[PDB]
Amino acid sequence: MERYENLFAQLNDRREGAFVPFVTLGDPGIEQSLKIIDTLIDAGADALELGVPFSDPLADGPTIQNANLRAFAAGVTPAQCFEMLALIREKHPTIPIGLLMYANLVFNNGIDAFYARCEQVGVDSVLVADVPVEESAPFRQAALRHNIAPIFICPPNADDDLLRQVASYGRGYTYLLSRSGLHHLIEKLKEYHAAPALQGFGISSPEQVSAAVRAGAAGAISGSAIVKIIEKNLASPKQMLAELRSFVSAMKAASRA
């Protein structure tokens, strides 16, 4: 499919940025997570980034570490995540769906088989957090053979060789990091015909979405801010969804011309 290409062309026609929430699949349980995701979409999410719970998420801060723990408390497994993904795609045929994976879960039963399963359930992209471009070949190749976009991170200091590699190897979008653990990066990515850039890390208010789009990014990704709302409202699921709806509506509105 070409779901990201279609989205970005449609947003460009509307002079509009993408707003892309991240959540952990199965946080805080399978059924509430499905409701959370439907609420994110109904509230205006342009695409989704979805984490599969992993025992040791090195690239994640405490908020998302805790989201993974909550999902593990509910017994969530990768197989259950793929069952969820199939249901999500069945309900929502056009929204781009990207996974955020750690390498072991992709490599475990075979890299090809992982990307084959992504294609089968209707996933559009995979970002493997701990595979740098230098190690990426078997991943990006398997991705492309199964019509999955391999997503790469472009760190804030990327030298020129790295920019060119990310531009060549990525598809779907380029994940532009706000920081470590800018118009120069954005223009160079465009010069090298990279996939459109989505800014992520630390995006938690409407003005940041507008700023990202003004800097020339195609949109913004927000995770910890969304997951915080989950964490805050564990005792009241209904208020959780209302607070999520309110947050996403505001972030998406900031992306519109």
């Binding site: 992993f54 025992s55 040791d56 998420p57 090195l58 690239a59 801060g61 405490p62 570490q65 723990l69 497994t77 990768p78 197989a79 390498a103 072991n104 879960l105 490599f107 475990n108 039963n109 957090a129 701990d130 595979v131 740098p132 471009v133 230098e134 190690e135 790469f152 991170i153 472009c154 760190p155 200091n157 790295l162 990091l177 470590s180 653990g181």
Partner: protein
Amino acid sequence: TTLLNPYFGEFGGMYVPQILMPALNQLEEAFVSAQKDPEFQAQFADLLKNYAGRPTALTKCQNITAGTRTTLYLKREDLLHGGAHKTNQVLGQALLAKRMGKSEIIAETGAGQHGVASALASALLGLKCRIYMGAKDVERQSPNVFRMRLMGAEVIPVHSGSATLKDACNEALRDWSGSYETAHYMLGTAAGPHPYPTIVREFQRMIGEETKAQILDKEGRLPDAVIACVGGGSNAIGMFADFINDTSVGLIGVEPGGHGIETGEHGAPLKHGRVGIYFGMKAPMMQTADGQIEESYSISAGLDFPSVGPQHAYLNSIGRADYVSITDDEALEAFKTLCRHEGIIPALESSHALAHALKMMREQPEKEQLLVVNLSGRGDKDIFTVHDILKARGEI
């Protein structure tokens, strides 16, 4: 692109987030430079000799082998400053950190030994050391925590995840990704992403180099086998490295068998795990059928890394080295045997290596063989562990 090969056959690599690649590349470049620098080599040699106490003895154990055709030597890393081999490589890594203009050290520790080694190197060399330690380990290893603090290190309890070694490792890497301009990550074994398996081997290789010279002096020939325990792989690769090209010399690595391999409660990923990608490398690990990383188990906390250095996986795959396991009870028996018959209290880690040599001897007592065990550390730290077990099961 790298200066050196990050792989040992299939195994190894640099499986870290993109943001950490410049730190790894910087470190590799610094290391390649240092290895060609006679001033760096001389400074390292001077610290090893005059601060740490190298060369370490090679001790013949004639009481243990009485009545057999085995001749057994122990390479005495238990006599090194700090009481374990870990001191060698932390001194090298501290010098590298200084070479790169860094004033700060980050380290992880589980049992606390690497923490203590990192702390003493940092104290000596004027580096500000912070150590990540899982909160369960902090609570479990009060003596080592207080040593680290006495030596001026900041000990940071990690309450996240399961609050053990892998969580400390992750917290250390998170910190480094933000601080690598001024802080060096002093990884504690011959594992993790390139260039660490290579750096740690090179900064431990004097173990085998000395052993070769000492055995040639004392016996006029090379060993039939050199035997070392394998947690992450540093003491073993340090013993092995200088002998790899001596094809007659057996290289035997001993993983912890815990309660027994068949129980699933063990620490022997190399022979009983499955290849995965974690800890920045492609290597055998302890993992679920689904790919979640699980724990090692051993009586010896120092052998709890649930994976293994990639060069060991490679040496096994080509048949150059052989890997075996030893249970808690076998290790305990070897510990008791050394104390009684040679007056040397071995680390429980090292006792696994010794236990396998004892088996080689006992199983075939008229086999003529010249064996070296790497006695990676002293076992003063283990006497309460050993006492409590012996008391619980009735003896003593």
